[PDB]
């Protein structure tokens, strides 16, 4: 209950000083969010328009948006109606009430998935290991079947039932939906669902380093030039007779 | 090359502070094009295929 | 370097991705009958959708070419004579006019005073040009997106 | 006003004219580069790369 | 605030200086430089390092003792 | 005539940045004074562009910050620039104070004492600034620190509830902390101006602690170009953080919205408060905690009265040099302990480092200076 | 020795407020300089206590203001103190400028020109401050004024949409206007400090426009006690408004929340912008409107170059005295027209007063000064 | 707000209980109705802004908190608008 | 900035002054005061008032003409 285990470092295609995210892996991961988690896990901060030019085309993202009934605002009469989703709509929340998540899951609350690889220590490594490392409880410790067993979970008792098993839907790419490939793709997508700027910051970061590598010796040489008047100055003391 | 490249650069463009500023300004424009794109081209090689600009032809219409 | 940071701080004022995606909004072409006006928020400033009936279209094409401040026809101002899409703010200072119950064709501004017709061409009052009109394209006759 | 009207001042203006011309060029190219003013920048060969 | 000409009395001191355009910025950068940094490291390692090496030991032991305290071999 | 001297505005600029007589021999350790000014300006310019988009209510306090990083054009660049700039400001404050202590610069009584006021004010700013995102650490840091004011006899509970605007860190606390966070940096800048006024009276000290009047050089161009190079190095360190490691010096709990009913597993400050956070938990008493906590910074005001050496600087003082580095290592020990839980080895060595900090400043360093005098027959 | 003279901080206070040689004969018209400083401080102290409770989002922008006046302990007192203090600031700015014009004080080129910058900055502040309650007048005032920047050739539409953060006065506009409203008064205070720096160079002018060097008296206690009495009179006028007529100088539409689809019957500024609002609607052109609007204040910067008299003050100048009072009455005419609709008599006499304002400053007053010289054989 | 002004504490509690005010999240995840406490606002007849239009005339009845400060003349105007309700003069049809 | 002792050259001027504790604050407040205010009103009414009286007429007429413009006796 007190003792813990930390996740190892999986060699992500984006973790590395100048390494951009695998956009195909983000794309695959959106699908892994679309069927599996979205009916239990909220993503209140990401919209369909966010996906445009990243993992899907404009036409593709509009088509994915239309697939849900989003509650629109005041009509001409004074009541709330339902319409097909536009690009500007947020990802749909399964529970409108915070306590509605408790009674319709386990009693425990499933946290929002927008910002999760930045909200838990280890990042995507932890979420990958929590999914991947679902195992049977050791003797002496009774699991209690409202709380499943996971070693990576801080208290060793997690209310989440493992939703990562070989083949939960396929991809347009001829990719086998194995447990590891299912778990990697969500984690590579959740990186983007916490840090969209990722690719851009690595880009300007290279430009930062390449500029400083040109500017640092140059400003040094400017300072060294002006200071050479003092650095090579010679003193002589000539007191009277 | 008979008088140095630096010697002819001082004589023509670094003497007057006017042409010194002009050479910096004109040199800032031409540097921005060679750098922005040049550093973007380097960013292409370390992320070969990974970027949307490489994928683009997959989803067309 | 200085250009880039100065530009980035400048850009942090100009757009905001969530506001820029609300630039094009959807309205019903079946909700409104002939003559009536609808209230909907497009880009921030009110969008007016007027349906032009048979006893109104012929009146606009009759008023002469070199009469208004800037020479602009009624035939070139609309993609089709059946429907006219309008922006509900004046070209002078930007004020929402009281629709239908006007004088020279339907519209009148309660700010300073500007007389507009079925298309919205300035007849009386200190305004430089005609009423604002957006871009036009069609795919279905019952739904149009203001691009 | 009337005090600055004389042969010396005409000489003094003629002396600073190439300089004041070149500062105008610095200001212009400076403004053009800083705003990315497309109207002027469409004319220059290597900077041309912004194909719509 | 004081300005030059009002600072202090100095007598019989000649200062010879060179224009920055007559002299090189990095005279003997590595040849004179490398010996110098080693010299002033040597001059100070006995004053700077022994508190940090002491912290390192108090850090390395402390972390070790924290881990091996919760676990127990008998009941 | 030279207009730099005659003109009332330019006169100040000339006397402060151009013609100011500066010591020939001042270290890279003198650079942090200008770097702090860069950091205060950087914080004002990033802070304002954040304030153009930030919402001061508990509802969308967290959402506005998200809106900045996600939707606002280059908003993520400004946000991490501000968050890392605050840390940059703190690395500089510490080098600057340490330099002042090592080189005996504190003997400039007013300059230094205004600097103590300057340190407290930047601390008060950063503390209030952290509450603004309204994350788990933002709220729980606030509740764990404000609640200390309860321990003051008689005045206590009334003070906390006056700072709180109620009975806990709530709606009102987030709003007023923004107001105070907006005004404070300007009051800092004005005090930083008075700081420099007092410095120019004597001019700068130097690594030897001997007067530099015999070898003064003009601030321009020597310290103009040296401050440019130094600022280019501070931008390197700041932009290394913002553009490669934006989450390194920050706490992950701040990425989940505030929850007054759920306390996090660990309650830790950003690195710059960890040393002082350690001192607080080290002493079991409530009031003794805050009184040791205030004395943790307020001690710097006593340092001039605890100068015992015949020499100004530590340059020629080996006994004092060792006891100085002991202070830096001891503070690094307190930093380490601050970011660790309150269990077995950490409670003891935590309070061990805590008693050492105060013994080193109050008793140990004033003794070394006396012995060093005896050794020189002084 | 007297520590008022020697001590670096107290030295400034002594040279500015205590031992400063001041003219024996300066009118109650010299009081507004100190009163403006009181007003700037009053606005900072009331403004901050409002910022401790105010919300910067379109949702509860109006509700927070309500929360202040209704729920916040004496919040109503602070709110009307701030709103009336802004008007008080404007009555003072106007007396001060008028005094400067009448008495020839503008011949202090830098002092005056810094004051022109000071006027624009207080104007820009109040304009942005009014948007904050997010009432009908707050929004509709904002839309009617910002939209003027569209009339600038080529740059136009791009500028408005950059200041707007979108395509109208929206969510973002309310937020950034608060940020800019928070920073500006501090930038004002710093410019007000530089204003005084330039004033102390020459000292004060006096009602005669002749030098007062032969009859200078120390600022303390004569102008200390005269500024105390003057401030007691400004508190009387401010507290008459706040505590008997809090809604007198304000517009009722600001008591209903903002509605971008519904334009109010009248669109009128607070009294302090009415004169300039009149000038704008008087000229039918879009660009000519803004160019006459900028020239409405920017003209004060030309006034020193349009001084033609051999004497400084208007004290001995009857032709100029009449043409001065004509300017005050003409501005009162423009004030009246600003708060009136654009129908029959008001369009003509509005633009009549508008052309007179510019003719009176640019042509009429510089002619009277020349004639007055001829009459004295000068 | 009424407490110690026009009613006692006991009186204002009794007036508050007379309405069904929609309270927040319960233990299950649904919104229930309870008797009103003192801290509750005065109950709004229309939860939607356009619901006031269809259930009155098409025209919107404005909020009554801030009305003698939101219309020129103040309370005199509201008194006169109520008091001075009269029959239309000839030439002008009222439209019912 | 200038201070006392550096302002200007003044010669042969005697100033006799009294302590504020020896003299009354309001010597002849109404007896000397009232005549004085009337005197300086009279000295300025011809320069201050005729623009305001002119505004008053342009205000009184303008307001009158605004009301009697919308109404009409014939159709
Ligand atoms: C997608 C397969 C998916 C992921 C990934 C995921 C992760 C996840 C985390 C990290 C938490 C808890 C945060 C923490 O680490 O402390 C968590 C919480 C719960 N989950 Fe989940 N979740 C995924 C999807 C699903 C699905 C499809 C369900 C329903 C079968 C589900 C259930 C829950 C529940 C319940 C919790 C709260 C219990 C708890 O951990 O305390 N998740 N999820
Ligand atoms: C608000 C952050 C601060 C700023 C902007 C600031 C500004 C500076 C500047 C510009 C200098 C001159 C350059 C230099 O010597 O470094 C300086 C020196 C000095 N400051 Fe600060 N400082 C601040 C924090 C502090 C603090 C916290 C202290 C003491 C607790 C301090 C005390 C001193 C002293 C004693 C010196 C003299 C150093 C010397 O020249 O020998 N300052 N300060
Ligand atoms: C003394 C200089 C300043 C310091 C040390 C400082 C410190 C901080 C800190 C530590 C944070 C929280 C970091 C984070 O979680 O991202 C913060 C955020 C904030 N600061 Fe400052 N700041 C300063 C200047 C200012 C100024 C002048 C403004 C107002 C113009 C300001 C407005 C903000 C706002 C709105 C936030 C919340 C947004 C955010 O968290 O990114 N800051 N600041
Ligand atoms: C931010 C509001 C302002 C403040 C706080 C301020 C401050 C003051 C102070 C304290 C004085 C000295 C006392 C006095 O003579 O009244 C003064 C005088 C002066 N100010 Fe301002 N002022 C401001 C606005 C202005 C403006 C708007 C102008 C010009 C457009 C102006 C130009 C002058 C001039 C010319 C004087 C010299 C008067 C004289 O002594 O003859 N000031 N100011
Ligand atoms: C240059 C001095 C200032 C002027 C002329 C000024 C002017 C104004 C004006 C005209 C209003 C709207 C009045 C109303 O409708 O009640 C306002 C409101 C406001 N001001 Fe200021 N103000 C100044 C100083 C400040 C400062 C320093 C702060 C920030 C500490 C501030 C924060 C506010 C806030 C939050 C409001 C909105 C609340 C309200 O309307 O009562 N003000 N101000
Ligand atoms: C609102 O909490 C803000 C924090 C913060 O900004 O940390 C860098 C914080 C976060 C977690 C836990 C506590 C926190 O606040 C603090 C505040 C604090 O204040 C001081 C700093 C230096 C010296 C004395 C004190 C005090 N009292 N000392 C330690 N932690
Ligand atoms: C957001 O609107 C704020 C207003 C305000 O604070 O009035 C005192 C306001 C209200 C209603 C109508 C317009 C309003 O704004 C303004 C702003 C304004 O700005 C100037 C003031 C003086 C001189 C030039 C200008 C300009 N441009 N001149 C006139 N009205
Ligand atoms: S904006 Fe419509 S007439 Fe003035």
JSON list of C-alpha atoms in Angstrom, two decimals, chain G residues 275 278-279 281-283 329-338 340-357, chain I residues 54-66:
[
{"chain": "G", "resi": 275, "resn": "UNK", "atom": "CA", "xyz": [-16.22, 68.32, -26.52]},
{"chain": "G", "resi": 278, "resn": "UNK", "atom": "CA", "xyz": [-18.80, 66.74, -30.88]},
{"chain": "G", "resi": 279, "resn": "UNK", "atom": "CA", "xyz": [-15.82, 67.65, -33.15]},
{"chain": "G", "resi": 281, "resn": "UNK", "atom": "CA", "xyz": [-19.55, 63.94, -35.64]},
{"chain": "G", "resi": 282, "resn": "UNK", "atom": "CA", "xyz": [-19.27, 67.56, -36.96]},
{"chain": "G", "resi": 283, "resn": "UNK", "atom": "CA", "xyz": [-17.06, 66.55, -39.91]},
{"chain": "G", "resi": 329, "resn": "UNK", "atom": "CA", "xyz": [-17.09, 79.07, -23.76]},
{"chain": "G", "resi": 330, "resn": "UNK", "atom": "CA", "xyz": [-16.54, 77.41, -27.19]},
{"chain": "G", "resi": 331, "resn": "UNK", "atom": "CA", "xyz": [-15.39, 74.21, -25.47]},
{"chain": "G", "resi": 332, "resn": "UNK", "atom": "CA", "xyz": [-18.47, 74.45, -23.22]},
{"chain": "G", "resi": 333, "resn": "UNK", "atom": "CA", "xyz": [-20.51, 74.78, -26.46]},
{"chain": "G", "resi": 334, "resn": "UNK", "atom": "CA", "xyz": [-18.78, 71.62, -27.81]},
{"chain": "G", "resi": 335, "resn": "UNK", "atom": "CA", "xyz": [-19.47, 69.91, -24.44]},
{"chain": "G", "resi": 336, "resn": "UNK", "atom": "CA", "xyz": [-23.20, 70.75, -24.74]},
{"chain": "G", "resi": 337, "resn": "UNK", "atom": "CA", "xyz": [-23.36, 69.58, -28.44]},
{"chain": "G", "resi": 338, "resn": "UNK", "atom": "CA", "xyz": [-21.52, 66.31, -27.59]},
{"chain": "G", "resi": 340, "resn": "UNK", "atom": "CA", "xyz": [-27.05, 66.19, -27.83]},
{"chain": "G", "resi": 341, "resn": "UNK", "atom": "CA", "xyz": [-28.45, 64.22, -30.89]},
{"chain": "G", "resi": 342, "resn": "UNK", "atom": "CA", "xyz": [-27.26, 64.94, -34.49]},
{"chain": "G", "resi": 343, "resn": "UNK", "atom": "CA", "xyz": [-30.53, 66.71, -35.68]},
{"chain": "G", "resi": 344, "resn": "UNK", "atom": "CA", "xyz": [-31.18, 70.22, -37.24]},
{"chain": "G", "resi": 345, "resn": "UNK", "atom": "CA", "xyz": [-29.74, 73.13, -35.07]},
{"chain": "G", "resi": 346, "resn": "UNK", "atom": "CA", "xyz": [-27.07, 70.94, -33.47]},
{"chain": "G", "resi": 347, "resn": "UNK", "atom": "CA", "xyz": [-25.28, 69.78, -36.71]},
{"chain": "G", "resi": 348, "resn": "UNK", "atom": "CA", "xyz": [-24.66, 73.37, -37.86]},
{"chain": "G", "resi": 349, "resn": "UNK", "atom": "CA", "xyz": [-23.73, 75.03, -34.53]},
{"chain": "G", "resi": 350, "resn": "UNK", "atom": "CA", "xyz": [-21.74, 71.88, -33.64]},
{"chain": "G", "resi": 351, "resn": "UNK", "atom": "CA", "xyz": [-19.47, 72.20, -36.70]},
{"chain": "G", "resi": 352, "resn": "UNK", "atom": "CA", "xyz": [-19.51, 76.02, -36.20]},
{"chain": "G", "resi": 353, "resn": "UNK", "atom": "CA", "xyz": [-18.01, 75.59, -32.71]},
{"chain": "G", "resi": 354, "resn": "UNK", "atom": "CA", "xyz": [-15.61, 72.94, -34.17]},
{"chain": "G", "resi": 355, "resn": "UNK", "atom": "CA", "xyz": [-14.16, 75.27, -36.86]},
{"chain": "G", "resi": 356, "resn": "UNK", "atom": "CA", "xyz": [-13.99, 78.07, -34.18]},
{"chain": "G", "resi": 357, "resn": "UNK", "atom": "CA", "xyz": [-11.87, 75.92, -31.78]},
{"chain": "I", "resi": 54, "resn": "UNK", "atom": "CA", "xyz": [-22.89, 84.49, -26.00]},
{"chain": "I", "resi": 55, "resn": "UNK", "atom": "CA", "xyz": [-22.89, 80.73, -25.28]},
{"chain": "I", "resi": 56, "resn": "UNK", "atom": "CA", "xyz": [-26.04, 81.13, -23.13]},
{"chain": "I", "resi": 57, "resn": "UNK", "atom": "CA", "xyz": [-27.87, 82.77, -26.09]},
{"chain": "I", "resi": 58, "resn": "UNK", "atom": "CA", "xyz": [-26.55, 80.11, -28.55]},
{"chain": "I", "resi": 59, "resn": "UNK", "atom": "CA", "xyz": [-27.67, 77.47, -25.98]},
{"chain": "I", "resi": 60, "resn": "UNK", "atom": "CA", "xyz": [-31.14, 79.02, -25.25]},
{"chain": "I", "resi": 61, "resn": "UNK", "atom": "CA", "xyz": [-31.96, 79.55, -28.98]},
{"chain": "I", "resi": 62, "resn": "UNK", "atom": "CA", "xyz": [-30.56, 76.13, -30.04]},
{"chain": "I", "resi": 63, "resn": "UNK", "atom": "CA", "xyz": [-32.65, 74.20, -27.49]},
{"chain": "I", "resi": 64, "resn": "UNK", "atom": "CA", "xyz": [-35.79, 76.22, -28.52]},
{"chain": "I", "resi": 65, "resn": "UNK", "atom": "CA", "xyz": [-35.21, 75.58, -32.28]},
{"chain": "I", "resi": 66, "resn": "UNK", "atom": "CA", "xyz": [-34.60, 71.82, -31.66]}
]
